[PDB]
């Protein structure tokens, strides 16, 4: 299962040079310094860098990079990517349901799952939880093991692998390394970039690519770097660890002849002989939604202290607000309370949606590793994530509030005059959280995202319609009031609630208002803020909130589609 | 400069056992596993754990722990503690001005500073910036060097040191280790707990304490662990790194005889012979304020993109608000605008103070390492930090707002009716930020702090006085309205601004109000919200905000004083 590469001159501005050498079966390694070219070479060789920077040829047993390459090549990321909240058996199933062909039945699929969990000994914990924050069933020793397995259901012949042991110390380290050694010669050409190994794991490599400063410096077998550096003229610290000795060479013991001293050695020509010798999606959309939805939903359930907690806090907020605004009399202090509670519901619905940006910034690493592999298409991931986490998390705090407070406060007592409030809170929640999605769909750090969203929401709240009479704003600023979501929410709620009311005890102003400074009816307070009264005057706010949703969602889908996946 | 310790039976519930052994001059080491007892032993031996858990005796050349011990013992923390924004020479001065006796003049102090920066070669960069986030002049190789120096101005004979090389790779690592080797036998008994060293630095140790699982397992010289484990019956991987070989022993190659196999060896009795043989603040308050103030102020200046940025954003907020509320007419839409802008100003002075909690949670590590050492007294640190960062950062956004918006908006045009607004904004800023200090004075993670503060501020804003008429709240909730800072700010601003106004064009209500539903004067809107009108009715809010400051500051000082400094 050879992987003869040839002249990988990658230019992002290089990061590499005319590398050579082939990686026969066994257990090939990439020693390197911390960040010279090692990880970059393992990325470029695993079809993980955009080809426009690569300017050379690679091969696969003699055929230049078939299209469905990643379909037959695993590549396990260095840091964990497995969903901790799910359990090992279900993680293996989720990896098996999306990437291997669904012409076979579920039966042989579970059969292969048991085959993998024995060829990678884990029936130890074949149903334990892995966990991230609030529960930690298994440890790293099994985390990396299930990460190695998660790409072994498809059974590729080239198991790419980067920095297996960074974060594991000696015991589990030797465990996973001997595991690699063993499951290698079932015919699997592992290619892993280790970070200062020991000598006890230096036993069996068959290959190692001492590469530093963007230039190759040795590509012989494992039992040859010792001899190569012997002929180079060093004692190598008679008792030492050579795998650290070579690094001790590169750092400060210079370079533009140390890289040069190798091409003249035997190994360059040794391999380059055979180099020049050889020189002459799968599934539907249905599954890719029906499984991403399951995974994200059961994940949401897995660590409930994140979401369920704010459900408790929204119940408490609803109850405390019902306690404060219990009466809602119809006297001069009726307008203040009524335009206060609705205001405080809308801006609340808004600023409690900035906590739904991590829908796409916690797992950018996971989404990216998944999409570079042939799991699904970005539209499927998007719709699944929405239908799983946005939809049933923003739909509850629109029913807790409006069922708890509506009868305590004693607002307009009608059926539709209640369902309209529920629906408008739902709409403003969805629209604000979708804007939150549109802003933070691409980043990886959440600081600037949360900052921008909190500033935008503050400005929208200023233009909401309570802190300033929207008719007295200057002409060249009144055009800004259309970008504000709290306006479209608060106006709809007001128009729902303020219509048939009379806020002046003893004075019937509906026939005519005496003294014309009084706001002795709901219509007068509603027009005084510049709000329509025709039935369109309400649903105009919903056709305007059903539009900010679609715009702020297609912007998010585009930001996901056009994101550099390399 | 020996440090013979004896039977350190620490109990937090142990973490250690009857350890023995002495640490003669040279370069003593603490190998250990990742977290067994190594770091804990180096902490307990450096007078860094509260003695109530220690139940044994230590010695210092024959005298049991003099009171001014840390006055003559450095202990450089593992992770960086140096202020990155300052520059190396000024960091060394700041360490020299607080901890060494101020009877000598500044002259010999700078002389010793040059002596140190040559004995620790850094005139390379003796004025470069170190930097944290936004500027990164020097690298880790000099960061750890200046951290090692920062405690060498006092010149202690016992230079405690924990994990020098964790985060430095080979080149600078060998640099600092050989530096330790060299500056050792000017007579300095370094005691450092290294984390899986190499053999190239395994040259010269004179000592090493292989301690794991809370129990000692070897305390011979450096050239003896090899022989001890020879007589123990292991080949030690003929070519390998022994410093990793011993760890390879402990992990899984068991314990309750491997610790037992040593006491019977020669070294236990070897040392325990001489064990049983030997068995029978500085400165004023003036300096400690005048220097913490300088350091914190120049630090604030060092990375200005943190503070100066929100000064830009407060200028922008002031200008945009001046643009929105330009007119402020005196008609029916005058009360809404006037009670809107003041509300927004108060609520923004509050919420924008929740960003001043990191005054004491970014450097809890630094304050703690500094106070365990004899730098200053906690009251000095407190007053300096206040006078340096709280005072001139909360005083500007009270002058940007009230000078930008007061003449655009065209509020009450008088001198004192302007300085009172400025002063009230200053008071509410100080009071809210002091509450922020009182909540987050002890923690180390800022998540729960910011969450609690945002919830408290949200509740105070509900009870502010605009979203609900404070006279219609039920009797058993009206007692809550006294805990709210936005109330005490917004009420003062209103009472300042609403007194002599007439908000009804053409109707002179000051003589008598017709139709009694009109709010045709400022007094009526001011009483309708339950606010006094006597001149005391305003300053009552300032005697109530000058009290929440003192309470929320003494609570912070107590939380700093009673914090576990170990």
């Amino acid at each position, epitope marked *: 299962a050879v992987l003869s590469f040839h002249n990988i001159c990658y230019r992002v501005k290089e990061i590499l040079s005319n590398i050579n050498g082939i990686m026969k079966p066994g257990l090939n390694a990439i020693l390197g310094p911390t960040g010279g070219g090692k990880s970059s070479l393992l990325d470029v060789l695993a079809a993980r860098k955009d080809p426009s920077g690569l300017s050379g040829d690679v091969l696969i047993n003699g055929a230049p990079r078939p299209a469905n390459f990643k379909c037959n090549s695993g590549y396990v990321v260095q840091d964990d990517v497995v969903m901790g909240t799910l359990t090992v058996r279900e993680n293996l199933q989720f990896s098996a349901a999306l990437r291997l062909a669904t012409t076979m039945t579920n039966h042989e699929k579970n059969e292969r799952i048991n085959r993998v969990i024995q060829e990678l000994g884990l029936d130890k914990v074949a149903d334990s939880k892995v966990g991230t924050q609030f529960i930690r069933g298994v440890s790293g020793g099994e985390r990396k093991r299930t990460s190695i397995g998660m790409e072994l259901i498809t059974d590729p012949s080239i198991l790419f692998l980067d920095e297996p042991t960074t974060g594991l110390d000696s015991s589990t380290a030797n465990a996973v390394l001997l595991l690699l050694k063993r499951m290698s010669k079932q015919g699997r050409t592992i290619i892993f970039s280790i970070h200062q190994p020991r000598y006890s794991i230096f036993k069996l490599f068959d290959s190692l690519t001492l590469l530093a400063s963007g230039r190759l410096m040795f590509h012989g077998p494992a039992q040859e770097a010792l001899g190569y550096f012997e002929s180079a003229g060093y004692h190598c610290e008679a008792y030492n660890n050579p795998a650290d000795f070579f690094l001790d060479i590169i750092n400060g013991d210079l370079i533009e002849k140390l890289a040069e001293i190798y091409v003249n050695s035997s190994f360059y020509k040794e391999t380059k002989a055979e180099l020049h010798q050889l020189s002459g999606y799968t599934t539907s959309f249905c599954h890719q939604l029906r499984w991403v939805s399951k995974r994200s939903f059961k994940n949401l359930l897995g660590n409930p202290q994140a979401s369920i907690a704010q459900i408790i806090v929204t119940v408490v907020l609803g109850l405390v607000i019902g306690a404060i605004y219990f009466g809602l009399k119809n006297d001069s202090t009726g307008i203040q309370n009524r335009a206060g509670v609705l205001f405080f519901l809308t801006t609340n619905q808004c600023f409690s949606s900035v906590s739904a940006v991590e829908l796409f910034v916690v797992e950018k690493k996971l989404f990216i590793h998944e999409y570079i592999s042939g799991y699904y298409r970005v539209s499927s991931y998007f719709l699944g994530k929405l239908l799983s986490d946005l939809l049933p998390m923003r739909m509850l705090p629109s029913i807790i509030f409006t069922c708890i407070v509506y009868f305590m406060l004693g607002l307009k007592p009608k059926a539709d005059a209640f369902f309209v409030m529920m629906f408008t809170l739902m709409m403003v929640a969805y629209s604000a959280s979708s804007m939150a999605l549109a802003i933070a769909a691409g980043q990886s750090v959440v600081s600037v995202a949360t900052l921008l969203m909190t500033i935008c929401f503050v400005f929208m709240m200023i233009f909401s319609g309570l802190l300033v009479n929207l008719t007295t704003i200057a002409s060249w600023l009144s055009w800004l009031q259309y970008f504000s979501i709290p306006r479209y929410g608060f106006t709809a709620l007001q128009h729902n609630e303020f219509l048939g009311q009379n806020f002046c005890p003893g004075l019937n102003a509906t*026939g*005519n*208002n*005496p*003294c*014309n*400074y009084a706001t002795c009816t709901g*219509e*007068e307070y509603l*027009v005084k803020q510049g709000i*329509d*009264l025709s039935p369109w005057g309400l649903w105009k706010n919903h056709v305007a909130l059903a539009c900010m949703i679609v715009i702020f969602l297609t912007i998010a889908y585009l930001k996901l589609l056009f994101l550099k996946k390399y | 400069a020996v440090l013979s310790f004896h039977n350190i039976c620490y109990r937090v519930k142990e973490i250690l056992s009857n350890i023995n052994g002495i640490m003669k001059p040279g370069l003593n080491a603490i190998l250990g596993p990742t977290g067994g007892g190594k770091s804990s032993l180096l902490d307990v031996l450096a007078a860094r754990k509260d003695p109530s858990g220690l139940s044994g005796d230590v010695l210092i050349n024959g005298a049991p722990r003099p009171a001014n011990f840390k006055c003559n013992s450095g202990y450089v923390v593992q992770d960086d503690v140096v202020m990155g924004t300052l520059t190396v020479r000024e960091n060394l001065q700041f360490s020299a001005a607080l901890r060494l006796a101020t009877t000598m003049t500044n002259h010999e102090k700078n002389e010793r500073i040059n002596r140190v920066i040559q004995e620790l070669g850094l005139d390379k960069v003796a004025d470069s910036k170190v930097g944290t986030q936004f500027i990164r002049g020097v690298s880790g190789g000099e960061r750890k060097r200046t951290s090692i120096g920062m405690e060498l101005i006092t010149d202690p004979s016992i230079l405690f040191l924990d994990e020098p090389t964790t985060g430095l790779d080979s080149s600078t690592a060998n640099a600092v280790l050989l530096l330790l080797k060299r500056m050792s036998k000017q007579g300095r008994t370094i005691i450092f707990s290294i984390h899986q060293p190499r053999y190239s630095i395994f040259k010269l140790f004179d000592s090493l304490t292989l301690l794991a699982s809370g129990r000692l397992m070897f305390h011979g010289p450096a050239q003896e662990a090899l022989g001890y484990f020879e007589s123990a019956g292991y080949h030690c991987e003929a070519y390998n790194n022994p410093a990793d070989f011993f760890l390879d022993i402990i992990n899984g190659d068991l314990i309750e005889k491997l610790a037992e196999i040593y006491v019977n060896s020669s070294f236990y009795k070897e040392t325990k012979a001489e064990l049983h043989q030997l068995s029978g603040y500085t400165t004023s308050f003036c300096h400690q304020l005048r220097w913490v103030s300088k350091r914190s102020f120049k630090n604030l200046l060092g990375n200005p993109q943190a503070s100066i940025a929100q000064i830009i954003v407060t200028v922008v907020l002031g200008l945009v608000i001046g643009a929105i509320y330009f007119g402020l*007419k*005196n*008609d029916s839409t005058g009360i809404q605008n006037r009670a809107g802008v003041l509300f927004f100003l108060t609520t923004n002075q509050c919420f924008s103070s929740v960003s001043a909690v990191e005054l004491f949670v970014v450097e809890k590590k630094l304050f703690i390492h500094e106070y365990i050492s004899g730098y200053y007294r906690v009251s000095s640190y407190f007053l300096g930090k206040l006078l340096s960062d709280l005072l001139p950062m909360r005083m500007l956004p009270s002058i940007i707002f009230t000078c930008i918006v007061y003449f655009m908006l065209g509020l009450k045009p008088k001198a004192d009716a302007f300085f009172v607004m400025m002063f009230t904004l200053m008071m509410v800023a100080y009071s809210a930020s002091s509450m922020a200090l009182a909540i987050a004075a002890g923690q180390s993670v800022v998540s729960v702090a910011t969450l609690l503060m945002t919830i408290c501020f949200v509740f105070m804003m509900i009870f502010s006085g605009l979203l609900v008429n404070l006279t219609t709240i039920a009797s058993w909730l009206s007692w809550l309205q006294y805990f709210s800072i936005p109330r005490y700010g917004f009420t003062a601003l209103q009472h300042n601004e609403f007194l002599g106004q*007439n908000f*009804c*064009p*053409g*109707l*002179n209500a000051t003589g008598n109000n*017709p*139709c009694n539903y*009109a709010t045709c004067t400022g007094e009526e809107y001011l009483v309708k919200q339950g606010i006094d009108l006597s001149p005391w009715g305003l300053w009552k809010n300032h005697v109530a905000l000058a009290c929440m400051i003192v309470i929320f500051l003494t609570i912070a000082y107590l939380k700093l004083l009673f914090l576990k400094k170990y």
Partner: antibody
Amino acid sequence: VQLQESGPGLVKPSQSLSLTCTVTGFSITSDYAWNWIRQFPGKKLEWMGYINFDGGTTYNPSLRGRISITRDTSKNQFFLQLRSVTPEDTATYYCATFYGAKGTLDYWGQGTSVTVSS
Amino acid sequence: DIVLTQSPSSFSVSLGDRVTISCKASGYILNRLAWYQQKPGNAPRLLISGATSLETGFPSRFSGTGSGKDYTLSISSLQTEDVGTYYCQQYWSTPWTFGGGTKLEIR
């Protein structure tokens, strides 16, 4: 309660204009707001601003800075000052008087016929 | 602003025909539309406030109706002293805009 309008019955363009409506029977600094309704020759009224009882004013936005109403409250007058007069506003000016707590221009002057021509 | 328009900008009635005048607004006035009655050579004297009330010194013929936008005055069997244009005038917004006003024709 009893208004009277009296000023120059001719101006030239780009000059100014003053009209000096002398209230009587009521102190203009006591209760109401006082207006300056003008009517074109095609019989179509325009508002043209008011001066409140305390001293504040508010002008018809269609008149940008071309109008300024002031009051010499010693003899309870209140004046009109229209500047840069176009020869089109050959109106009539009527010196109206707001009420505030009822809303209607209860009392009106007699109106002069300003003619803005050479 | 709010442009008050009276589409029937001229009428032609006989001495007794219960004629009405319609003054539709361009926003929402909320019964704040007042009617004046200019005579040929005088100042418009108030006729109806609040769109429903009357003014002491006037008969009980005149009477206002309508709400929201479409307000109407309704003279009942106009007598001889009833000629002369009729201007509506909202007073809800800040620039108070009158109307075109409808003369009256005696057959």
